[PDB]
Amino acid sequence: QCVKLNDGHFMPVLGFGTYAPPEVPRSKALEVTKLAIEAGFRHIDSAHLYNNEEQVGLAIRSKIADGSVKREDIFYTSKLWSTFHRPELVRPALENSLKKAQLDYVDLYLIHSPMSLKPGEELSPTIFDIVDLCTTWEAMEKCKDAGLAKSIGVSNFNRRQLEMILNKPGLKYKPVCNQVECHPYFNRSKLLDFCKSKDIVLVAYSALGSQRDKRWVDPNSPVLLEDPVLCALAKKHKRTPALIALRYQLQRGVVVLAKSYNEQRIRQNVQVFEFQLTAEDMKAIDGLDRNLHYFNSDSFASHPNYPYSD
Numbered sequence: 001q002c003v004k005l006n007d008g009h010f011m012p013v014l015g016f017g018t019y020a021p022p023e024v025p026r027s028k029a030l031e032v033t034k035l036a037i038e039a040g041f042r043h044i045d046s047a048h049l050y051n052n053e054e055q056v057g058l059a060i061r062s063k064i065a066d067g068s069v070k071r072e073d074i075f076y077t078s079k080l081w082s083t084f085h086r087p088e089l090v091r092p093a094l095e096n097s098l099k100k101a102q103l104d105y106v107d108l109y110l111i112h113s114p115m116s117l118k119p120g121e122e123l124s125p126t127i128f129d130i131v132d133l134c135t136t137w138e139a140m141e142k143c144k145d146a147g148l149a150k151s152i153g154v155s156n157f158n159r160r161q162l163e164m165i166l167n168k169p170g171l172k173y174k175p176v177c178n179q180v181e182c183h184p185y186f187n188r189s190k191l192l193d194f195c196k197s198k199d200i201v202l203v204a205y206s207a208l209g210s211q212r213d214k215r216w217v218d219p220n221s222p223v224l225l226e227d228p229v230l231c232a233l234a235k236k237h238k239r240t241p242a243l244i245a246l247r248y249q250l251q252r253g254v255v256v257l258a259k260s261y262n263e264q265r266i267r268q269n270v271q272v273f274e275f276q277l278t279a280e281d282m283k284a285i286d287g288l289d290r291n292l293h294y295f296n297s298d299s300f301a302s303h304p305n306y307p308y309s310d
């Protein structure tokens with residue numbers, strides 16, 4: 001239940017999303033990540049941005065300590081925040097994430113976003129920065145060579161941003177993945193074909209339609225999990241709309257994340273491996289595509305490097 005990455009490492013095809021908004025107590029992250037591992041998740045997705053790396057790292061170390069899993073059975077991802085794009089800041093930012101989680105290495109480190117922000121400890125300084133992401137990428141390469149990250153990749157990059165890295169003079173390591181918003185309303189078919197042509201894995205976030213956080217998501221936007229085609233497919237397969245949306249991705253060759261802080265829904269989500277969709281089903285889902293990205297905020301849209309500009 002793994003995909004082989006372009007550097008020889010393996011990535012579990014279903015990942016646990018760990019972001020929760022700051023009104024959720026930090027202690028929840030520890031509890032739900034343990035539940036995710038007990039359920040059968042082996043891919044755990046975190047980031048400096050999420051302010052949960054201590055808890056998530058502790059959940060992983062607990063499950064190693066109690067004997068359920070070994071470190072090498074867990075694929076752990078963190079991400080370089082956008083205030084740390086300057087090359088000399090990359091490795092220290094990774095080392096801080098590692099110290100927070102109390103781990104020797106991350107399976108995957110990503111550039112969280114191509115939209116550089118003014119350097120500082122403040123996450124949302126209130127202001128943009130201009131940085132050659134090719135130099136950021138060089139510093140990511142050195143973190144791989146150092147054994148700080150097994151694999152390195154990008155997140156929120158469009159085709160052109162991804163091409164910039166791929167065409168870089170003296171490239172040593174291709175991004176193994178690009179983790180992007182991806183679900184039946186914004187299925188990224190063209191970007192997905194581009195990544196397949198390069199042996200780069202596309203990892204889908206907001207695959208269940210996002211947490212609909214009012215800071216970036218319009219509450220008027222359609223609720224993906226109430227979609228009538230999804231609901232009709234869930235009735236046909238006697239599963240749930242969430243399960244259909246996750247299975248859709250696996251059948252497209254997409255690595256899919258699923259966040260849930262709910263005990264029942266965490267266990268429910270690993271049922272994605274227990275059924276499959278037919279071609280007529282996949283076509284019905286493909287027909288939902290309507291260029292809708294839930295994250296739709298002035299914070300992003302006015303950035304010189306906004307990925308949805310193309």
Ligand SMILES: NC(=O)c1ccc[n+]([C@@H]2O[C@H](COP(=O)([O-])OP(=O)(O)OC[C@H]3O[C@@H](n4cnc5c(N)ncnc54)[C@H](OP(=O)(O)O)[C@@H]3O)[C@@H](O)[C@H]2O)c1
Pocket residue numbers: 016017018019020045046112155156179180204205206207208209210211225240242243257258259260261262265266268269
């Ligand atoms: N690279 C980036 O910039 C980026 C951006 C967004 C997300 N991500 C990563 O991707 C992860 C997932 O994306 P996301 O946070 O946008 O959320 P998501 O996976 O789209 O989930 C949205 C909501 O779906 C609900 N849910 C989960 N399972 C369900 C089920 N079986 N039935 C009904 N509802 C279900 C969850 O609510 P409950 O908790 O109540 O179950 C969750 O809040 C994030 O946690 C983060 O790790 C990365």
Ligand SMILES: Cc1cccc(Nc2ccccc2C(=O)O)c1C
Pocket residue numbers: 019047049112113156216295300
């Ligand atoms: C478009 C963009 C740019 C930088 C970071 C993110 N990611 C997040 C933004 C707010 C809250 C959570 C996340 C996430 O990474 O889960 C996105 C969606």
